[model samples]
Target: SPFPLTSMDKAFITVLEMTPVLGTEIINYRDGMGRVLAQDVYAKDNLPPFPASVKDGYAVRAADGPGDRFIIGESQAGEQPTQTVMPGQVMRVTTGAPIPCGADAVVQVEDTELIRESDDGTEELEVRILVQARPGQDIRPIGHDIKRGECVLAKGTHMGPSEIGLLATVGVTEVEVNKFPVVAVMSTGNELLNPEDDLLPGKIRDSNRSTLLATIQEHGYPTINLGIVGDNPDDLLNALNEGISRADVIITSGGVSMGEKDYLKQVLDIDLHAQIHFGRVFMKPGLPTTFATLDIDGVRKIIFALPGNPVSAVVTCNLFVVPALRKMQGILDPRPTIIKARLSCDVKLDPRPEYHRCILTWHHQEPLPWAQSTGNSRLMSMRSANGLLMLPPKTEQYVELHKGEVVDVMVIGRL
Candidate 1:
């Protein structure tokens, strides 16, 4: 017998408190994408190490009086200037070129008119004070983007493509990042057969393994699909043991509910040190969610036996497993970004809290309360959905939402 599931907040918090149970390692910069930094990355050297140009213009001494004329010295992006501007002089420079010595400002090339020709028959340029000039204007100061000894990125920051670019900008070729936890996924049921195999009578194609594996891989970690375990307790136990030996987390769908062939709960109780904290949750399409953890062979492993229904299993994985995996991977803000949108139609809520699947789209044409609903949970519903509109539990009757009324939406869907 398993207890009812309650206190989702407590469940999530407890799992988070167990975090950083994992360790860290240094990985190559290219491989560090989607991994969390284990240590703060400090700048090895100052950015720009020298005064640099901000635009393709003239670099001049801010102290130079207006209308001052100087021979047009030159500088490019990589080459150092041969001559420094003396008082009342300017350097014709392009973007990212080092500021010539004794220059503190850059004036746009368009700002001045060529008044004279150089001694060598080149165009001579001068600063025309059409407006008051300020020191360091149009010039990127040294250490403006990054300073010496400053932390470029803090520990526990998850690295995305942009983060990788930023790290590369600071010349970090390797980073110390948290290790991605390995997960083992298994689906149980004697009636389950491989999708590739011909489906015999009383058997259905296995859907959990591939779906769960894909979901786990989407978070940027290694996954081991242990395949399906039958309803037999011994086979289930052996599979569980194998998965436990190979993974940090073991996930199995089906065989946790109170059916006659539900041996997963029994095997966990009789042969393992697992504590089945809760076996049912107060969520739609996922009320039969099960959470259990055990120490196997001196290592701690967690297992969740999700309901057999495909929709329930996938929904549970998104609501709970995804967040848990991200936290294990050292993501502090693992939750999806929630946005507000107007509900398109009124629907009755189940007795327990339910996640109403909907495709939230941009509906700005009607009014502040603009939104439309497809009112179905078919694959088509997801095809056009830009997000999931979270509905609360115990909502009774049809609560019609106007076009532009704001509702909470999870920003993840096919469309």
Candidate 2:
């Protein structure tokens, strides 16, 4: 028999501790999205690099403002000004263009009028300022956004679009990021059929494989479909062996409970000699969830034997598999973000901890989001659910939560 069941917290910690750190590779910063940075990134130079204009106007000395001035030259982006703005003279500068030497302020084009133009009428010869200018007004000084030698991004940061743009702004074309894990998804049962195949009287279509594959892919990890394997030990062993050969992690739905046809636990123990870290957890809807590790050619491969129920499979994958994948990619804090919200309705507590799927909504004038349960483990119950209420188990003092009780909610999807 498998070892005694483990608590949810212990099982989660065990899986994270056993996850192997993946290697890193140098890739273009643009391709580093969704990957974790392997090293700290510092600003190479100041953001502005010089005093620059924040508006399309004239760069002039503050003391020479509120008077007609001769236009000395023009300063556009990507080029330096050759002529300095002397007293009573201004240089027309476009937004983001460097301010001319000896110029301390910018008079917005809206506050100035062209009093005279060159013979061709293409350039301003003289302009009249309508407002008094203050020193440093509308001018972005050097290092206004970031300073050189400053740490912009720390190591182990998850790269996103904003991070990519920041890296590009700092002239970092190449970045070192942790390599992504290769995942293999499989479903086990004798009564399951492919979606394209005709369903027999007692057979059901295999939704777990596609769902699990999409879930893994949605998190930016590539998945290998191992297809459906029956309840035979030989077939399961063969599929698992192949998965170990190609993938860093293997996920399977079904065949993990006490049923006689559940041969997944046996195959992992007797056939493959894989170490079963935890075979059960004290959680509802997914109590039969199993986590194990196998050493293939000296590399450790993680295997998550999730429940057969569709909702249970998705819940455990989000709570366990996603975090493990994140840790493998060198993310320092890989746990799912949790927030607090008010219960929209009364909820009875179960004997075991429950991750109740819920839909979070904000009333027109309410301050906190209200959560409503999405019913039970049926796949339909999770429709439109973007959060999960982490309800505590029933105890002598607390049997159920009232409608207005505050609860901790895990954000599983976008609101």
Candidate 3:
């Protein structure tokens, strides 16, 4: 006999605590996108090594007030200006150019009138300030953008374009990030056939492996396809050994239920001696989901033997596998985000709680968000589905949920 069914809550709890211990790697910041930082990146130098101009104008002394001043020299980006702005003197400067010595403020070109120009008409010889300049006007102070020795990016930060820009700003070329796990997906059944192959007597295309592999890859984890293995104990053991030795996590669909040929549990128990955390979860569409873990050579490997149904494999992958992968990547919060959403259609409650697939939409930021049902047809429920609505179990008081009723929905996709 198989193990007793565990409540969805209990099974989820069991899965959450089973994240594998992963290592860290030093990667170039350019390749660090989508990786989790393992250490705080400190600023090696100030963002602007010097007080920089915020506009193309003149750098002048604030005490000189509004008047005509001699344009001694120019201060453009990429070089330092040695000229000092004295009283009644101005230094022509471009945006991001360093403020020259003795200059207290910047007067934008729009606020100044050109009074003289070089014979070639390429350089300004004299300019009259139209507005009184204030101290530090149009200037970014030293260390204002970023201070030296300041912590720029903290540990557990997911690297993105902005984060990468900040790293470059702080002169960090490389960073330590958590190593993401490599997932190995497999399908087990004598009736399983490759998608492109012609169907035999009682065989169908192996959709579970393809779906599971794509789902795992969509979450940014590396995946290995172990392909399909027939219902044979020796073959299953060899596949399990291969996944254990080569991958951090192994996911298999089928051969986990009560069929006489179901030998995955036996292999895991006797050959691998894996700790079966939960063999069955009491949730619709995924009651046969199983989770186990075993250590090989002091390294732990996670295993998830999911149900054979296509929808069930995808649903459970989003629910359990993704969160585990998130944690393995050192994400601070591994729990799925639950949001309040109004159901667009009435739904009859089942005896067991169900995660009904739905298309969540705000329709360009409506006041109330709607979770429209994708219908319960396993054949088509997962198409364009972005969320799973948490439906309550039937009871004597409530047998159905009406449209416009608010319920908890776990977000599983982009808005």
lDDT of each: 0.75, 0.90, 0.89
**Rank order (by TM-score, best first):** 3, 2, 1
Query: Please, what is the TM-score per model?
Result: 0.87, 0.92, 0.96
Clashing pairs in 1: 341-407, 359-385, 368-404, 369-403, 369-404, 369-405, 370-403, 370-404
Candidate with the greatest lDDT versus the true structure = 2
Candidate 2, 340-368: lDDT as tens digits: 89997888899888887788878899788
lDDT of 3 at 33: 76
lDDT of 3 by residue, 84-186 (tens): 8888999999999999999999999999999999799998999999999889999998888889999989998988899998987887888999899999999
The Cα error of candidate 1 at residue 25, in Å, is: 1.2
Q: lDDT of model 3 at residue 175?
A: 91
lDDT per residue, candidate 1, 26-100, as tens digits? 888888878999999989787887788888877877676567567567888998777878877788888899888
RMSD in angstroms between candidate 2 and the native structure over all alpha carbons: 2.7
Model 3: per-residue Cα lDDT at residue 47: 73
What lDDT, from 0 to 1, does candidate 1 have? 0.75
